[PDB]
From Swiss-Prot:
Superkingdom of this protein's organism: Eukaryota
Further remark: Proposed to contribute to the pathogenesis of various chronic inflammatory and autoimmune diseases, and cancer. High serum levels are found in several inflammatory events including sepsis, rheumatoid arthritis, artherosclerosis chronic kidney disease, systemic lupus erythematosus (SLE). Seems to be implicated in other diseases characterized by cell death and damage, including diabetes and Alzheimer's disease. Its nucleosome-associated release during secondary necrosis may play a role in SLE.
Section covered of the full-length record: 101 to 155 of 215
Protein's name in the database: High mobility group protein B1
Role noted for this protein: Multifunctional redox sensitive protein with various roles in different cellular compartments. In the nucleus is one of the major chromatin-associated non-histone proteins and acts as a DNA chaperone involved in replication, transcription, chromatin remodeling, V(D)J recombination, DNA repair and genome stability. Proposed to be an universal biosensor for nucleic acids. Promotes host inflammatory response to sterile and infectious signals and is involved in the coordination and integration of innate and adaptive immune responses. Nuclear functions are attributed to fully reduced HGMB1. Associates with chromatin and binds DNA with a preference to non-canonical DNA structures such as single-stranded DNA, DNA-containing cruciforms or bent structures, supercoiled DNA and ZDNA. Can bent DNA and enhance DNA flexibility by looping thus providing a mechanism to promote activities on various gene promoters by enhancing transcription factor binding and/or bringing distant regulatory sequences into close proximity. May have an enhancing role in nucleotide excision repair (NER).
Amino acid sequence: AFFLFCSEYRPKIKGEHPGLSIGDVAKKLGEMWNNTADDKQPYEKKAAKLKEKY
DNA sequence: GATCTGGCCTGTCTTACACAGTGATACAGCCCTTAACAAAAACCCG
């Protein structure tokens, strides 16, 4: 949920207000994503689709 | 003295005889955050 959600919301969250380091940026953003599945499922669905396609 | 040579002189052609090591520059991995979803040999009582 949160992994695919961060890999999806990368553009705006990384080009609007990143933070101190890429580490802390993606950490806080993945936390917010996991605390949003209820609103991030299709990103994980696309991830699993690519995984099956591989 | 003509016509011969072998003696000598050139007159090419063959194989050897060092380019690897130096400072600076440039990229490619390779650890660092969460994070969740899937994955995983190992094994017990089943």
